[PDB]
Amino acid sequence: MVFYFTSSSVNSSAYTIYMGKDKYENEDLIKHGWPEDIWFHVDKLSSAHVYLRLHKGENIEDIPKEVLMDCAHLVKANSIQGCKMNNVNVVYTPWSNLKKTADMDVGQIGFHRQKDVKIVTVEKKVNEILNRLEKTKVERFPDLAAEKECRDREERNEKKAQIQEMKKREKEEMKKKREMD
Amino acid sequence: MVFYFTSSSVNSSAYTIYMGKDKYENEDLIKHGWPEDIWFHVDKLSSAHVYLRLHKGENIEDIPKEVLMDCAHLVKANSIQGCKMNNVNVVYTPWSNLKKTADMDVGQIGFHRQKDVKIVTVEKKVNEILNRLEKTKVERFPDLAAEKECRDREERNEKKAQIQEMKKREKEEMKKKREM
DNA sequence: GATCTACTAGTGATCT
DNA sequence: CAGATCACTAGTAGAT
DSSP states (O other): OEEEEEEEOTTSOEEEEEEEOSHHHHHHHHHHOOTTEEEEEESSSOBOEEEEEOOTTOOGGGOOHHHHHHHHHHHHHTBTTTTTOSEEEEEEEEGGGEEOOTTSOTTOOEESOGGGOEEEEEESOOHHHHHHHHHTOEEEOOOHHHHHHHHHHHHHHHHHHHHHHHHHHHHHHHHHHHHTO | OEEEEEEEOTTSOEEEEEEESSHHHHHHHHHHOOTTEEEEEESSSOOOOEEEEOOTTOOGGGOOHHHHHHHHHHHHHTOTTTTTOSEEEEEEEEGGGEEOOTTSOTTOOEESOGGGOEEEEEESOOHHHHHHHHHTOEEEOOOHHHHHHHHHHHHHHHHHHHHHHHHHHHHHHHHHHHHO
16 A cells, blocks of 8 residues: 655646655665656654656656655654754655665665765754645555556657657658659 | 546646547557546547546546546547537546447447437637646557556455455454354 | 368558 | 558468
8 A cells, every 4th residue: 555645846747746655665665766756755753665667758856846845844844853943854855775785674775876865954844845845645545566567668658659650750751762762 | 559648626636637549559559448437529520539547436427527527628639520510518427338349440439328328518628738738648558458458456355355454354343243 | 181161460552 | 640441462260
């Protein structure tokens, strides 16, 4: 079981935010995460693992500030100690940067690249943001490997389509080439 | 190839709106459509088939009017003869109601029940709706059978956890009503 | 291998 | 003036 939320931005584009609070569930989310997912955790303390799912080709640097602060408010509110302390640092890095060494007890994670870890400090607490996110809170029992399988199949199909387009363009090229000779 | 749009509600809940590229891909949409999908088409004219993905458990009568008018604007704008008029009736029914006979031709679809077909009228035309939805447009090449398989697996897991909860519940209940 | 059918793929033109 | 469709020709999978 995984938690799901939605964060709308001023861009008129909505983002999906899924959170496990469970160490085992956090392991399953670490396993099957997508390349478009951004991992959020409170820095020094224990907290739930909060994921922000970016659109395709969207870059971590392009995350709108309001959705970022939504994820940071979410992971701060779900930090056991963090929901008390009023200035807290939230570390977030792309799921592609999460490194699981076998020395890691279940549910704890490392990083491939220290440069790719970003940090954002949340001051105090905002009840309005948490209310808005709670309106969109829904529970799910997904098959993570299957859903990522669907994602990868879509990427494969898009690449194949791109290849077909290229071959069509090349055939039209050669056609105009012979028609100019 | 399938087009995907996002319609935000006034409560700031997002809805997915998908529309096929051609009528054959739309046959693919008809085949693998989800039980949460609501099918949209222009009434008695020729148009695109625009689908709305409802939240799990949401009912066709629960649709917010803004999302409904977004979908209806989307079929109207994509209709050959429909984008040119000022009043266009749009029929919509749950995907579960769609019936496809081998007699039917590509782009045509029937209904198991006439009582489940609904109508909503689009008056005039709005460019702000169309452009707003256009900024969320994205092209995808999904595997629809695998995606509906994922949805059904989620439903299965949900029902399993449910009947597990009932099993533990009636267990503890039998213990209490036994020893008390 | 020798026919044969039954399908898919490719291509140029012609129609919207 | 891009895409759908027609009218072919040519290639491939089985099957006898």
